[PDB]
């Protein structure tokens, strides 16, 4: 299926924001097949949040993820100036990666 993301997000530095991702599919393996990517304007994307119960190495604890039912959530504790980028969620459940519409997070 196709993923749905808000058009843009807004939040003051210091507070927390939440990005929604509805439309994640599932299979006989599990329900945690959700990943997030951050792409700054003028460069390639980078894997930030995948397997929301965990997180990759070299990534600060500011980026957190969760999922309730068929909706995924991206929780960012602290907002900084270098956080203005497009955040896409990806569903890789049925052996097929699908990228959402994306959101514009500005501080």
């Amino acid at each position: 299926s196709a993923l749905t993301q808000p058009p843009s997000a807004s939040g003051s530095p210091g507070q927390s924001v939440t990005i929604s991702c509805t439309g994640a599919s599932s299979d006989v393996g599990g329900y945690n097949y959700v990943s997030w990517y951050q792409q700054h304007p003028g460069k390639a994307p980078k894997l930030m949040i995948y397997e929301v119960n965990k997180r990759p190495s070299g990534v600060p604890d500011r980026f957190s993820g969760s999922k309730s039912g068929n909706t995924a959530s991206l929780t960012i504790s602290g907002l900084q100036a270098d956080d203005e980028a497009d955040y896409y969620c990806c569903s890789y459940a049925l052996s097929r990666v699908v990228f959402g519409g994306g959101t514009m997070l500005t501080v």
């Binding site: 599932s26 299979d27 006989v28 049925l94 052996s95």
Partner: protein, 50 residues
Amino acid sequence: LDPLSETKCTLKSFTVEKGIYQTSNFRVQPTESIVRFPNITNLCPFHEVF
């Protein structure tokens, strides 16, 4: 061809004595059409496992 040839083949002989002397055959009415009635559902999600 005819009941005479049928009872000849049954008795395995070209000469048949007086009387029935055997049972010719058994009548079995065959079918003339087919009646299939499966269920009406949607496509099975086989992609969720494979």
